[PDB]
Amino acid sequence: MRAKWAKKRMRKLKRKRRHMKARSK
Amino acid sequence: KKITQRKNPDPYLKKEWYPVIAPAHFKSRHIGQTPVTKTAGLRVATDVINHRVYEVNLGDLNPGAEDLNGNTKFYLQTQLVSDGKCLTNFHGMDITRHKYGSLFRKGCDCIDVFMDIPTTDGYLLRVFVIAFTDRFRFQRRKNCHVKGRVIRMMRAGIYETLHNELGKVSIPVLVTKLSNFEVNAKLTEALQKITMCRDVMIRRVKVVKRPRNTMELLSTMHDSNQVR
Amino acid sequence: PVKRRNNGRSKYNCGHTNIVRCQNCHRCVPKDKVIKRFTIRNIVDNTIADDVLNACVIQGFAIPKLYNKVQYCVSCSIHNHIVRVRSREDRKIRTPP
Amino acid sequence: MNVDLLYPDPVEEQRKHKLKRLVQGPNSYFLEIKCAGCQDIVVVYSHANTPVFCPGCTSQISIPTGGKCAFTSQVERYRQ
Amino acid sequence: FAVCHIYAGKNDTFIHVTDLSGRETIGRVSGGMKVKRHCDEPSAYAAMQATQDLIEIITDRGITAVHIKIRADGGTGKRVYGQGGSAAIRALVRGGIKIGRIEDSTPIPTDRTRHKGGRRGRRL
Amino acid sequence: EPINARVIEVLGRTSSRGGITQVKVEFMTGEKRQIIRNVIGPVRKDDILVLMESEREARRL
RNA sequence: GGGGACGGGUGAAACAGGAUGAUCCCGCCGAGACCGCCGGCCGCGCAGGCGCCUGCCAAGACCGCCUCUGUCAAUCAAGGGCGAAGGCCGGGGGCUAGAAGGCGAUCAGACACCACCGUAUUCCCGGCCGUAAACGGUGCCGCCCCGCGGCCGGCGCGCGCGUCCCGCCGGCCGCCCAGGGAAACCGGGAGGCUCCGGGCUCUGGGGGGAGUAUGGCCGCAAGGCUGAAACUUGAAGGCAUU
RNA sequence: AAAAUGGAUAA
């Protein structure tokens, strides 16, 4: 799996983005 | 009789061999000989061997015809010891692995029934019967799959035929029907009218329920042949 | 490209088949992508052909024969040579050899 | 054999499905049965999928079938 | 008589003799005890050495009829005997121990409980 | 004592490095056992070789 | 109850188990899973999917048809239901496998692959979630379309009378005549198209950025659905032949 | 059973 690993990497960035937004909001 | 008269080490330094006597139904009533520590300690010698079950081929039990009974085993459980010779009564009957594997073939229907019949003695036995249906003599299709109506008919027929060939039968009468394979032959004639069947046979009849104190049955299956 | 029309499986009209495991790999391949070649052989090797029957006391006893289907995975089979890599023309022919 | 669809051989129309005929129509017809007191015609539906009863009797003349209905007594062909 | 249980398992072939009840062992040997090489343990040469040493222990015991209950690791895998299964029988041939019925007794499953390696299998 | 044996017939070389010519055999003292054994080096049909083990033949063909 | 020594384990081994008697057999006993072989160019379901025993209810196409109405039809926004697996919530369970975790060997290093141990999970009942290479990567109804077939379900006509022969319809399939296409190849269509027009619906417009950002909405979450631009680059990509 | 790599640029 190489494209699914890219999708997993995006989902983790998307999840870190939502925790970061919460800290600054 | 090979250790009481012989020299062998540690465990077998002190041991004796006691006979195993099969029921009167069989022809060669010897099963074999059993190593058991001689009467020593809290247990008594022939008090250990009474609970040991002995499995012997029906072909060995009845010498004379070997293709018949050659692949069918008889389970025999010691039920009492008389004169130092343990006597055994039916503990079940099992077709052996070579004869279970032989029947299954690609393309044909398979039928398995599970039947519980209580004996007059008090032994409810689970009888397992296998059936396959082949082609109707010359048939257009090599595969032999048949209609479901005549599949339930085979299944309902087996339970009814099993009641018919095993009514109020005591263990002697049950064993004798498995002695000559009479019941399976009857199964050929019950399902004969419907689509041709093959290997209609009793694979197993396991004793499920055992009443204690069946010394009555043990005498019946060891010496009531002379009366009957 | 579609190497084969069956797409590598015999699954037809179902959409699902019961899954078993390679005897060797233990890889789970649905029943349709399974080698499954039926095996029937004498239990002692035919090298002990009649040496056993001459040793056997009981008259007319036939050496027991196993009747087991062997189910292998596609990957395990090509490396164990149960089936080879056929040519484009060769693939269509069936006729069990 | 230069037969054209305009005139198809009768057997062709009789072999094909009753809707796929150049002239579509009934496959079934009326077939007689025989009853007590009757040497005359006792017509019934050929493909009856329901019970018909002996005239003035309790017993059922025709056995139920998805196809042409079968009978247990003497019977007479089509219309006579 | 005697029942010769040959567990022709991979890793080691086991030859253990009992007499009709299965509770009395008149002799237990296995291919593992006779070979230093862990991988050569289930080999025929070990089977030959382990039996014969066993068949003197069943003639000293006094028995001479052996019904061979040959088995395979079975359960949820295998189902085919290791090379040791025939070799023990060949050792029996060397002593010519009169033999009875040779019906296979590998444990067989009716609907399994599943085996190791996952659904990708052992990626050896 | 080692057994006495002469090849009944010949079989082809093995091992991928050759060398292991295989040859069948028979026993002068015994039943002329027709067992398959393997040999290292040159052999002829009906030539004689020493079978030390005797009890078990080598790998089948 | 034996009974007697290493037992696993592998590619070879190593870690564990054993004189607290291991492995092995045989008679048990408890537990939960699973329904082998039969199991298939089989069948059934709207898909996802669906295989112990009997009993029990309701259900569905197909065929047969001198039954009934009488256009009640097609296809779809929006909306409603269902939807593998894994996840998750609250009860339960708990055998086996086994995300994590430890461990051995493995190599330069493997924290990977191969063993060994094992929690979540697997199992069950009520919930969510709403995804798949959800595949035939082929929307849905409609109609004509060439021979040889196999299977399957009814349903007929003659033959001697068979589970025959010719088939009639609904499917399941293999080869393929046209014919199409870049070809692989579909041919019960991916044929009847540049000699283009039966109808309804979705969806795309070089390759990255990008299912990304934001604005919603739904969800307990994990995430799903809708969905950018700035910016970059000359190829990306299909089937073939050597 | 163990095997990782190979500058750019034209040829």
The number of domains in chain F is 1
Tokens of B61: 């039990």
Q: Which residue has the tokens 């056995």?
A: D63
Q: Cα-Cα-Cα-Cα dihedral of B92, B97, B100, B105, to 10°?
A: 170
Contacts of E87 in chain F (CB under 8 A): 56
CA distances from A19 to A9, A15, C6 (A): 16, 7, 49
Q: Which residue has the tokens 């009514």?
A: B167
Do the chains contact at C55 and E92, CB–CB below 8 Å? yes
- Method used experimentally: cryo-EM
B8 domain-assigned: no
Whole-number Å distance between alpha carbons of B49 and D6: 95
Neighbours of B35 (CB within 10 A): 25
Strand G footprint nucleotides (protein C-beta < 7 Å): 1-14, 22-28, 32-45, 47-54, 63-67, 95-99, 113-116, 136-137, 150-157, 162-165, 167-169, 171-175, 184-186, 190, 211-214, 222-224, 238-240
Q: Show the domain range for F37.
A: 1-60
DSSP chain D: ----TTS--HHHHHHS-SSSSSS---S--EEEE--TT-SS--EEETT--S-EE-TTSSSEEEE--SSSPEESS-EE-S--
Query: Mapping DSSP to helix (H, G, I), strand (E, B) and coil, where does residue A10 land?
Result: helix
Dihedral (CA of D17, D19, D24, D27) sign: positive
Q: Which amino acid is at D58?
A: T
| Strand G contact at CB of residue E34, distance < 7 A | no
Q: Mind telling me how many Å the CA of F55 is from chain E's nearest CA?
A: 7
Among residues B179, B133, B131, B182, the alpha carbon closest in space to that of B159 is found at B131
CB E64 within 8 A of CB E98: yes
Tokens of F12: 């082809």
Phi and psi angles of residue E62, each rounded to the nearest 5 degrees, phi first:
115, 0
The residue among C44, C67, C69, C71 with the most chain B CBs within 10 A of its CB, best to mutate, is C67
Tokens of E88: 């023990």
The number of domains in chain B is 1
Query: Mapping DSSP to helix (H, G, I), strand (E, B) and coil, where does residue B146 land?
Result: coil
Q: Cα-Cα-Cα-Cα dihedral of E22, E25, E26, E32, to 10°?
A: 120
* Closest chain C CA to residue B101: C67
Whole-number Å distance between alpha carbons of F19 and E20: 50
Whole-number Å distance between alpha carbons of F47 and F21: 13
B4 domain-assigned: no
Max CA-CA distance within chain A? Answer: 36
Whole-number Å distance between alpha carbons of B37 and B24: 28
Q: Which residue has the tokens 């055994």?
A: B88
Contacts of C21 in chain E (CB under 8 A): 115, 117, 119, 121
B7 domain-assigned: no
Strand partners for D61:
none
- Report the first-to-last Cα separation within chain C, whole angstroms: 28
Q: Which residue has the tokens 């996952």?
A: E118
B48 domain-assigned: yes
Q: Cα-Cα-Cα-Cα dihedral of E93, E98, E104, E106, to 10°?
A: -80
Tokens of A14: 């998307």
Chain C positions with Cβ closer than 8 Å to B: 38, 58-62, 64-68
Confirm or deny that C24 is annotated as ligand binding: yes
- For residue C13, what is the DSSP state? S
Q: Calculate helix-pair angle for B182-190, B149-165, nearest 10 degrees.
A: 140
CB F25 within 8 A of CB F35: yes
Work out whether strand F20-24 and strand F10-14 pair parallel, antiparallel, or are unpaired.
antiparallel
What is the SS3 string spanning chain F? CCEEEECCCEEEEECCCCCEEEEECEECCCCCCCCEEECCCCCCCCCEEEECCCCCCCCCC
Beta-carbon contacts of B70 under 8 Å, excluding residues fewer than 6 positions away, are B57, B59, C58, C60, C61, C62
Nearest by CB to residue B35, choosing from E26, E101, E108, is E26
Whole-number Å distance between alpha carbons of B100 and C65: 11
